[PDB]
């Protein structure tokens, strides 16, 4: 237990937001998370993250990003919902739900009129739902009014931590049909309440017409549905156990101590204009890339971007002052900067701003982002396509992905009736993404005639649509609306009898023929084109009609319904020359929206579709030299690279060669590819398509004489490479991922993950005079896809080099069956298998770790870890689809250290788990060492004796350590709290090596009647642990889980043997009683087991609910006295402690951070700090009484201290300062300083360029040049050589701080100012430390930050008044380990000596780390070596004398 001690925050090192990139996973996506930097308040707080995913689409934080609480939504992935009893619901995890069963085996429904003891106005039908995969065992309820007119339905989620969450109670937290509020797409989190009576409330704003054009309003009247997160209130004044939304009225805004406000452009974006609590009156801004989504069968319109997040605290309320007319005060401010764009808006910067009491801003360096972009300017021109040279230039071909490999091959008819397919393949010895085409395979024979379905590609499903012009056209079924062959509503009107022909005019766009809304008429040979295509970027095949001067699009709403026509201006051609045949529809820029490509004789005109709203001014693209497009030519748009973007392929007969390609982009745009924290750290990311990866995999599978089987039919953009640059050291880390065994599942239209991930990490260093050999590490990992035809092929690929290793684990499947209950294994049916195998998707099966260092042992792994999974099937109202709880029941780790024959091996098994997933019985096994071989497997340079002497009998003893435990739960009535600590016991079993099962332990061998951990078998009792509770029945928990004490076993009969010659029973026992020990029942008892001596720890007395159940007193044991705790007004922080000797500590709090700023100790002496707007200590002092009289520093009231603005000023202070310490922080020093006066003077333009560069976020308002803002500006507008010169002369330096420490009180004229300077890097690591010293001999720093050196080569010495001792200087590698650590040195400057000069001139020890991050070698500055060798059973250390003899 933690006894509360009051103390002031200690000083200090520069570090950012806790921003972090995710580990590379089996989904292959780049992820990124920023914790929102705002107060936790009392402890119960929103704790949200602004997070990115490369898989994610657009939203209120730009492409890829989100920041939202939990929700429940109608399922849209398996058909559009119709707002009837046939709709399905999704859990917060995105997982499909079904109605659950109760004890009796029926639909778990009930009626209620009381919720949390609170009378409801009318009665509700309350249905429990269960998701298909169980994560946490959350309880989920649907609340439906019995009389449908009484109100709207809502959801409740009971989290097993004891908290209760309510979604969509009121209409502001519901995404609903603009036309009809009953039809609810989504219920959003609105209120949480905890067992302590603490709340969080979430307020949303509905979408509306404010600051939109009349064009926009006209086109999109159904605009009210969407919700945006607007305010989050927490730190409720009134402690209440029931939800606030169940009272007659919600609390006033003033009953919440903390607010989090999301601004959507209404407030001034400037760092100089302090944001106020209320929004001002100009209204939220309209984004340019407005977009709609139709998933739910209703338009949801999106117009808003979040520009600021703001933390507000009620300072008067917190300080128990007069609340009348209190405005909450701003504590922290997060600005969000966007690159605003008509197609796709992207989040490019987030920055922290706060304010000094004089109003002036203080800033952290901005965290910047940039993305892959489509460049209008540098569109790659045409290029001949030798892959189609076998065709003559008249022969028609379709570029099309016939087999579902994610890359198109060549489909062609040689002679009539004879169709062949050339499948895409890796071109050998080309570019690494170069695509060639393989051997022809004959398609199946096609019927006499009919538009009709066919299984053309041999996958079992009727998913190709064949039609005839007599030519023949192949069209994938997914390019048409879902019920094309059984249409309804408008779709029926359009096709009527059925269309005469379907022709692809792009990868997923198809032209149509024949012979409530006003739909188009499909004319016979008109000057007009009709088609199915996604012209809106919502991901449905919408209806589009193109005439010579109009583009009209009708949104597919599902089930054949089509909504009102939308126009898209900016496309036209002359009414005499417009030809439908020359129109193509394909997403050229990867924005999600199909673009228009129109072809003339000598050029192409590309009209980019702007977020489905209009078309851009057309890009003109010239055809190759001397080409004249006409009817004899062939042109199509097709994603030939496998990038999810169209290139163009063109055949021209009157031309040599006949076949051409134009790739318009080589990257998929709008994916995050650069982060820069502006502190010396940049991460660059590189993507490579799953499709491209498939062609690599297919070549390998073909080279090995095997038949390739692809299971992922479309291109996904996978995280291929990360390069993490240390801009200060010049070092880097490359992380490369490779993917295999990709699995998509047709039945559920769901991605399952990749079956194998190979990760390679490689350090890159800048050059030094003592070079570090970089040895890359390789991790090979296999994950379950949950498709057995994939999953059964994986163990084949495991490392086979240890013939004695145990056989691969196998997934266990269980059913819960009750008794006085338990898991029981079964073999499921092929029907239930599908769902229970799916439950293991993404689970780690095995991981192998290598070092690719070219040595003989390189092919042998350091370690191998493998896991066994158990899926427990759980019944629901759905008989066809069981629910499932996946767990990891065995883990086996082999430690080889790259020697195959003599590994160490351990295994941990969860034998029994309770109904709520908690482990009841488990065991940790340590296997014996293998039988000693004849010759030594270890290299012959060790002592000859060592191999034999490495053996010990303790290595041959099998150990199994058994652990039992149980838990408290509170599931009675309408509360839900699981897994509370209760009891634990541990038992040691030890056997000889003969008794280890020959093929290893499994769960089965451990539960068997003859088990080595059976209750028959002899054991050693290792101890036990018990938690006792108070405030409920006996020592059992209430919902508040208030601990009474913790109890652990200290002595059993075996351990009492200690006292045998020294004390006797009577004297021994009465000593143990007076020592505070006591007898308690031995837990999980066996027959005749005596009580054990236990020690009890951690006693607290708690307050009542009005005091938020906070602790009011504490003691460690009953032998010592208690310490009292007094809280502030609203029970946020403790302001006084009083111990058992009446000694009193007190604290006053800075309520913008809820940390103390002043502290009165037991002798009434005073301690004080000044916190800056980011909560850092910039000054501190103390005073009080000593030796009869007042003592210490002058008070802050007597002598206020102003902290100097710069380091220069601070280094120039005179003695006599009334502070113990003061601190200047320079977190933004890696950013170059550039002022308006610098700029305006260097051009003579009166700030024309300065205000352009500020707008474009090249530079911040406070004069710091942003790394990625520069690069973005340089790419678009360039930069004059007058500016480049200025910029090249403005230096920069790593993040740093100066701390001044006084050695005497300010009354004493002997006071000195001690001066200490710290340098950090972009990863927050301490780089070096400089202490000011007396004048004397030092080395010399030049203006360019290099060392001055003599002609002789040793550093040039001078005597100086400005001498500093540099200590702890460390060069880090990628993993953050000290690769070089330098000796201390004197220097005539506090500034940073370049890592360039350091490596050449200063003495350093070099530390070399292995792939597990263990130091195995050191090269001392003098030249000597310490080496160390790791083996499973021994480690060998060699010092400088040992190695020197080599």
Partner 1 sequence: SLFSRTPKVTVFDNRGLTARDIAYHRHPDAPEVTNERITPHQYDARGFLTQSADPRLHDAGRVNFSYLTDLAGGVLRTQGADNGTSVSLNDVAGRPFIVVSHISATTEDRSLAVTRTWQYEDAALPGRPLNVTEQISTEVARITERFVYAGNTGAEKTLNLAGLCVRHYDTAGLVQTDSIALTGVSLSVTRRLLKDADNPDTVADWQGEGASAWNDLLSGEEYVTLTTADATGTVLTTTDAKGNIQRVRYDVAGLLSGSWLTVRDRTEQVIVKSLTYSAAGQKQREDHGNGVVITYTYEAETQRLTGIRTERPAGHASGAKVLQDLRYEYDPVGNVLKITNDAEATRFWSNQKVVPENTYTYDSLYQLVSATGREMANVGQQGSRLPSATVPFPTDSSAYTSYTRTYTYDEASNLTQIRHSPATRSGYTTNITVSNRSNRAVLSNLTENAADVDALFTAGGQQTQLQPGLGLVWTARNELLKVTPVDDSENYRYDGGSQRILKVSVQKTSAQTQRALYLPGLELRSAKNGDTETESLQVITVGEASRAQVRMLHWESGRPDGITDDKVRYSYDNLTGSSVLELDSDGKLI
Pick the closer one to Na ion by CB: 1098 or 1192.
1192
Pick the closer one to Cl ion by CB: 720 or 1157.
1157
Binding mask 1132-1161 for Cl ion (x = CB under 5 A): -------------------x----------
Q: Decide: is 616 part of the binding site for Ca ion (CB under 5 A).
A: no
Pick the closer one to Na ion by CB: 1160 or 1165.
1165
Q: Decide: is 2 part of the binding site for partner 1 (CB under 8 A).
A: no
Q: Which of 581, 948, 992, 1241 binds Cl ion (CB under 5 A)?
A: 992
Nearest CA-CA partner of 1 in 1025, 1114, 1125: 1114
| DSSP, res 1300 | E
User: Which does residue 587 bind out of partner 1, Ca ion, Na ion, none, counting CB within 5 to 8 angstroms by kind?
Assistant: Ca ion
Q: Decide: is 383 part of the binding site for Na ion (CB under 5 A).
A: no
Range 455-484, binding Na ion (CB under 5 A):
455, 457, 459, 461, 463
Q: What length is written for the chain?
A: 1446
* Alpha carbons 1412 and 947: distance in angstroms, whole number: 24
Q: Decide: is 137 part of the binding site for Cl ion (CB under 5 A).
A: no
Range 775-804, binding partner 1 (CB under 8 A):
none
Shortest Cβ distance from residue 1150 to Cl ion (Å)?
5
Is 406 exposed, middle or buried (CB count within 10 Å of its CB: 0-12, 13-18, 19+)? Answer: buried
Is 911 exposed, middle or buried (CB count within 10 Å of its CB: 0-12, 13-18, 19+)? Answer: buried
Note the Cα 429 to chain centre separation in Å: 37
Q: Which of 926, 1036, 1155, 1360 binds partner 1 (CB under 8 A)?
A: 926
Range 1311-1370, binding partner 1 (CB under 8 A):
1311-1315, 1331-1334, 1336, 1365-1367
Nearest CA-CA partner of 212 in 107, 287, 311, 323: 287
Note the Cα 829 to chain centre separation in Å: 37
Pick the closer one to Cl ion by CB: 315 or 446.
315
| DSSP, res 345 | -
**What are the residues facing 1028 on neighbouring strands?**
1045
| Of 136-144, 453-461, 510-518, 1118-1126: span binding partner 1 (CB under 8 A) | 1118-1126
Helix (H) or strand (E) holding 288: none
Pick the closer one to partner 1 by CB: 1235 or 1420.
1420
Pick the closer one to Cl ion by CB: 1151 or 1409.
1151
Which residue in this structure is represented by tokens 């379905």? 453
Q: 701-722: string of b/e by CB count within 10 Å (b at 16+)?
A: beeeeeebebbbbbbbbbbbeb
| Of 40-48, 429-437, 602-610, 1349-1357: span binding Ca ion (CB under 5 A) | 602-610
* Alpha carbons 693 and 424: distance in angstroms, whole number: 12
| Of 462-470, 580-588, 1158-1166, 1195-1203: span binding partner 1 (CB under 8 A) | 1158-1166
User: Which does residue 988 bind out of Ca ion, Cl ion, partner 1, none, counting CB within 5 to 8 angstroms by kind?
Assistant: partner 1
Give the DSSP per-residue string, 630-641. Answer: STT-EEEEE-TT
Pick the closer one to partner 1 by CB: 67 or 1366.
1366
Contacts of 1149 (CB under 8 A, 6+ apart): 318, 1128, 1133, 1135, 1155, 1156, 1157
Binding mask 109-148 for partner 1 (x = CB under 8 A): ----------------------------------------
Shortest Cβ distance from residue 421 to Na ion (Å)?
13
User: Which does residue 509 bind out of Ca ion, Na ion, partner 1, none, counting CB within 5 to 8 angstroms by kind?
Assistant: none
- Cβ 518 vs Cβ 509: under 8 Å: no
Please note each residue after which the chain is broken, C-to-N distance over 2.5 A, or write none.
12, 450, 469, 515, 820
Q: Compute the C-alpha angle 762/767/768, nearest 5°.
A: 115
- Cβ 432 vs Cβ 721: under 8 Å: no
Binding mask 198-217 for Ca ion (x = CB under 5 A): --------------------
Pick the closer one to partner 1 by CB: 315 or 996.
996
Pick the closer one to Ca ion by CB: 1065 or 1437.
1437
- Cβ 835 vs Cβ 750: under 8 Å: no
Range 1170-1229, binding partner 1 (CB under 8 A):
1182-1188, 1191-1193, 1220
Q: Which of 282, 376, 949, 1185 binds Na ion (CB under 5 A)?
A: 1185
* Alpha carbons 1107 and 1092: distance in angstroms, whole number: 38
- Beta-strand pair 1144-1150/1134-1138: antiparallel
DSSP SS3 for 409: strand
Q: Which of 601, 1017, 1057, 1285 binds partner 1 (CB under 8 A)?
A: 1057
User: Which does residue 1433 bind out of Cl ion, Na ion, partner 1, none, counting CB within 5 to 8 angstroms by kind?
Assistant: partner 1
Nearest CA-CA partner of 335 in 295, 305, 302, 371: 305
| Of 12-20, 271-279, 1243-1251, 1378-1386: span binding partner 1 (CB under 8 A) | 1378-1386
Contacts of 1051 (CB under 8 A, 6+ apart): 1072, 1077, 1092, 1093
Neighbours of 1179 (CB within 10 A): 23
Q: Decide: is 1081 part of the binding site for partner 1 (CB under 8 A).
A: no
Q: Decide: is 1000 part of the binding site for partner 1 (CB under 8 A).
A: no
| Of 43-51, 569-577, 584-592, 838-846: span binding Ca ion (CB under 5 A) | 584-592
Q: Decide: is 404 part of the binding site for Na ion (CB under 5 A).
A: no
Cα dihedral 268, 269, 274, 278, rounded to 10, equals 50
Binding mask 1009-1028 for partner 1 (x = CB under 8 A): -----------x-xx-----
Binding mask 1106-1145 for Na ion (x = CB under 5 A): ----------------------------------------
Binding mask 542-581 for Ca ion (x = CB under 5 A): ----------------------------------------
* Alpha carbons 716 and 694: distance in angstroms, whole number: 11
User: Which does residue 457 bind out of partner 1, Ca ion, Na ion, none, counting CB within 5 to 8 angstroms by kind?
Assistant: Na ion
Range 1123-1152, binding partner 1 (CB under 8 A):
1139-1144
Q: Which of 432, 767, 945, 1065 binds partner 1 (CB under 8 A)?
A: 945
**What are the residues facing 422 on neighbouring strands?**
410, 440
Give the DSSP per-residue string, 22-76. Answer: PPP-TT---EEEEE-----TTS-----EEEEETT----TTSTTEE----EEEE--
Binding mask 1404-1443 for Ca ion (x = CB under 5 A): --------------------------------------x-
Q: Decide: is 1165 part of the binding site for partner 1 (CB under 8 A).
A: yes
- In which order are the strands placed within the sheet that holds 473-476? 452-454, 464-467, 473-476
Cis peptide preceding 657, ω within 30 of 0 = yes
Pick the closer one to Cl ion by CB: 137 or 1174.
1174
Pick the closer one to Cl ion by CB: 300 or 1132.
1132
Nearest CA-CA partner of 49 in 23, 20, 27, 71: 20
Q: Which of 1163, 1235, 1280, 1342 binds partner 1 (CB under 8 A)?
A: 1163
Shortest Cβ distance from residue 995 to Cl ion (Å)?
6
Note the Cα 1290 to chain centre separation in Å: 37
Residues at the contact surface with Ca ion, assessed by CB under 5 A: 587, 589, 591, 593, 595, 609, 1442
Binding site for Cl ion (CB under 5 A): 315, 991-992, 1151
Per CB under 5 A, residues contacting Na ion are 455, 457, 459, 461, 463, 1163, 1165, 1184-1185
């Amino acid at each position: 237990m933690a006894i509360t001690t009051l103390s002031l925050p200690k000083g200090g090192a520069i570090n950012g937001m806790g921003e972090s990139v995710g580990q590379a996973g089996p989904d292959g996506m780049v992820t990124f998370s920023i914790p929102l930097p705002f107060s936790a308040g009392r402890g119960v707080a929103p704790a949200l993250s602004l997070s990115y995913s490369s898989g994610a689409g657009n939203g209120p934080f730009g492409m890829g990003w989100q920041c939202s609480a939990m929700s429940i939504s109608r399922r849209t992935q398996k058909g559009v919902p119709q707002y009837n009893e046939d709709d399905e619901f999704l859990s917060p995890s995105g997982e499909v739900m079904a109605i659950a069963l109760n004890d009796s085996g029926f639909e778990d429904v009930r009626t209620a009129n009381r919720l949390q003891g609170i009378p409801l106005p009318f009665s509700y039908k309350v249905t429990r739902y269960q998701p298909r995969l169980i994560q946490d065992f959350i309880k989920i309820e649907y609340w439906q009014p019995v009389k449908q007119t009484d109100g709207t339905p809502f959801w409740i989620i009971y989290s097993p931590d004891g908290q209760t969450h309510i979604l969509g109670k009121n209409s502001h937290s519901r995404v609903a049909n603009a036309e009809n509020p009953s039809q609810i797409a989504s219920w959003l989190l609105e209120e949480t309440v905890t067992p302590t009576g603490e709340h969080i409330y979430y307020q949303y704003s509905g979408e509306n017409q404010v600051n939109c054009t009349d064009a926009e309003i006209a086109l999109h009247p159904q605009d009210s549905a969407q919700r945006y997160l607007a305010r989050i209130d927490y730190g409720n004044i009134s402690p209440q156990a029931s939800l606030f939304v169940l009272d007659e009225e919600l609390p006033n805004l003033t009953q919440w101590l903390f607010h989090l406000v999301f601004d959507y452009g209404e407030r001034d974006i400037s760092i100089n204009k302090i944001p106020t609590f209320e929004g001002g009156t100009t209204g939220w801004l309209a984004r340019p890339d407005m977009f709609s989504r139709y998933d739910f069968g209703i338009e949801i319109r999106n117009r808003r971007l979040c520009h600021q997040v703001l933390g507000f605290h009620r300072l008067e309320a917190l300080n128990d002052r007069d609340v009348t007319d209190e405005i909450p005060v701003l504590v922290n401010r997060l600005t969000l900067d966007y690159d605003l764009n008509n197609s796709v808006s992207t989040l490019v910067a987030v920055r922290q701003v706060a304010y000094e009491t004089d109003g002036s801003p203080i800033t952290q360096p901005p965290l910047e982002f940039d993305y892959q972009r489509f460049d209008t300017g540098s569109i790659p021109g045409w290029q001949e396509m030798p892959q189609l040279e076998a065709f003559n230039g008249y022969q028609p071909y379709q570029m099309i992905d016939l087999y579902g490999e994610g890359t198109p091959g060549i489909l062609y008819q040689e002679t009539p009736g004879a169709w062949w397919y050339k499948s895409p393949q890796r071109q050998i010895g080309g570019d690494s993404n170069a695509v060639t085409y393989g051997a022809m395979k004959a398609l199946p024979k096609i019927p006499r005639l009919q538009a009709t379905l066919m299984d053309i590609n041999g996958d079992g499903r009727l998913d190709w649509v064949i039609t005839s012009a007599e030519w023949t056209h192949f069209t994938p079924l997914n390019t048409l609306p879902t019920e094309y062959f059984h249409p309804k509503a408008q779709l029926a009107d359009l096709v009527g009898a059925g269309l005469s022909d379907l022709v692809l005019i792009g990868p997923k766009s198809v032209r149509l023929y024949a012979n409530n809304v006003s739909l188009p008429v499909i004319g016979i040979d008109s000057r007009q084109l009709v088609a199915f295509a996604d012209m809106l970027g919502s991901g449905q095949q919408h209806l589009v009609e193109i005439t010579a001067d109009s583009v009209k699009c009708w949104p597919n709403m599902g089930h054949g319904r089509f909504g009102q026509p939308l126009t898209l201006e900016g496309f036209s051609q002359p009414q005499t020359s417009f030809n439908p045949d020359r129109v193509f529809l394909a997403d050229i820029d990867g924005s999600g929206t199909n673009d228009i490509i129109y072809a003339h004789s000598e050029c192409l005109e590309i009209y980019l579709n702007e977020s489905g709203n209009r078309f851009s001014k057309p890009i003109s693209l010239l055809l190759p030299d001397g080409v004249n497009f006409d009817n004899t030519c062939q042109l199509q748009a097709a994603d030939i690279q496998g990038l999810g973007i169209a290139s163009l392929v063109m055949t021209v007969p009157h031309m040599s060669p006949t076949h051409w390609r134009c790739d318009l982009a080589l990257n998929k745009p709008w994916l995050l590819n650069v982060m820069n924290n502006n502190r010396g750290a940049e991460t660059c990311l590189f993507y490579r398509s799953s499709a491209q990866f498939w062609l690599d995999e297919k070549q390998l599978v073909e080279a090995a004489g095997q038949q390739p089987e692809c299971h992922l039919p479309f291109p996904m953009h996978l995280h291929w490479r990360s390069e993490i640059f240390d801009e200060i050291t010049g070092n880097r880390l490359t992380q490369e991922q490779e993917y295999a065994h990709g699995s998509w599942d047709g039945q559920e239209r769901e991605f399952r993950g990749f079956g194998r991930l190979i990760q390679r990490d490689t350090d890159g260093f800048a050059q030094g005079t003592v070079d570090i050999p970089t040895h890359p590490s390789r991790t090979v990992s296999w994950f379950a896809t949950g498709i057995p035809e994939i999953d059964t092929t994986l163990s084949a690929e495991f490392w086979r080099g240890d013939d004695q290793a145990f056989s691969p684990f196998s997934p266990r499947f269980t059913r819960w069956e009750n008794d006085s209950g338990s898991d029981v294994a079964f073999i499921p049916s092929e029907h239930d298998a599908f769902w229970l195998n799916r439950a293991m998707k993404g689970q780690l099966l095995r991981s192998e770790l290598y070092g690719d260092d070219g040595t003989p042992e390189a092919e042998i792994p350091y370690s191998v870890t493998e896991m066994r999974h158990q899926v427990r099937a759980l019944p629901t109202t759905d008989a066809t689809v069981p629910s499932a709880w996946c767990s990891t029941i065995e883990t086996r780790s082999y430690q080889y250290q790259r020697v195959a024959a003599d590994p160490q091996c351990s295994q941990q098994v969860v034998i029994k788990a309770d109904r709520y997933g908690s482990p009841l019985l488990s065991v940790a096994i340590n296997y014996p060492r293998r039988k000693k071989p004849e010759k030594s497997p270890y290299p012959d340079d060790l002592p000859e004796t060592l191999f034999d002497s490495s053996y010990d009998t303790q290595q041959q003893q099998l150990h199994l350590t058994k652990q039992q435990q149980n838990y408290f739960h509170l599931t009675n009535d309408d509360n839900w709290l699981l897994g509370l600590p209760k009891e634990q016991r541990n038992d040691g079993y030890q056997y000889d090596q003969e008794r280890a099962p020959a093929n290893g332990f499994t769960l089965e061998t451990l539960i068997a009647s003859n088990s080595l951990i059976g209750s028959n078998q002899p054991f050693t009792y290792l101890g036990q642990s018990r938690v006792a509770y108070q405030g409920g029945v006996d020592e059992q928990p209430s919902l508040q889980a208030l601990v009474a004490y913790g109890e652990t076993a200290i002595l059993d009969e075996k351990t009492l043997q200690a006292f045998v010659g020294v004390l006797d029973s009577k004297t021994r026992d009465e000593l143990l009683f007076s020592a505070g020990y006591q007898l308690a029942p031995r837990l999980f008892r066996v027959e005749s087991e005596p009580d054990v001596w236990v020690a009890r720890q951690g006693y607290s007395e708690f307050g009542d609910y009005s005091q938020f159940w906070r602790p009011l007193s504490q003691r460690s044991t009953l032998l010592t006295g208690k310490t009292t705790l007094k809280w502030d007004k609203h029970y946020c922080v403790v302001i006084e402690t009083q111990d058992a000797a009446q000694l009193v500590t007190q604290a006053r709090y800075d309520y913008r951070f809820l940390t103390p700023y002043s502290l009165t100790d037991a002798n009434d002496n005073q301690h004080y700090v000044v916190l800056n707007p980011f909560g850092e200590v910039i000054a501190s002092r103390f005073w009080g009484t000593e030796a009869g009289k007042d003592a210490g520093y002058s008070t802050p009231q007597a002598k206020p201290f102003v902290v100097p603005a710069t380091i220069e000023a601070a280094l120039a202070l005179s003695p006599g300062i009334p502070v113990a310490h003061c601190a200047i922080f320079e977190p933004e020093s890696w950013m170059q300083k550039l002022t308006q006066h610098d700029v305006s003077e260097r051009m003579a333009d009166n700030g024309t360029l300065w205000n352009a560069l500020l707008q474009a976020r090249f530079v911040t308002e406070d004069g710091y040049v942003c790394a990625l803002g520069r690069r973005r500006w340089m790419a678009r507008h360039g930069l004059s050589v007058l500016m480049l010169t200025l910029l090249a002369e403005i230096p920069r330096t790593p993040p740093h701080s100066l701390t001044i420490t006084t050695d005497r009180y300010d009354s004493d004229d002997q006071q000195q100012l001690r001066q200490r300077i710290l340098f950090s890097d972009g990863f927050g690591r301490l780089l070096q430390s400089a202490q000011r010293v007396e004048a004397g001999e030092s080395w010399q720093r030049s203006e360019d930050s290099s060392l001055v050196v003599n002609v002789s080569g040793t550093p040039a010495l001078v005597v100086t008044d400005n001498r500093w001792a540099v200590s702890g200087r460390t060069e880090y590698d990628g993993k953050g380990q000290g690769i070089r650590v330098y000796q201390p040195y004197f220097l005539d400057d506090w500034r940073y000596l370049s890592d360039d000069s350091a490596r050449t001139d200063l003495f350093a020890d070099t530390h070399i780390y292995d792939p597990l991050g263990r130091e195995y070698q050191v090269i001392t500055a003098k030249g000597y070596r310490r080496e160390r060798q790791y083996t499973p059973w021994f480690v060998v250390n060699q010092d400088e004398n040992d190695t020197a003899a080599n």
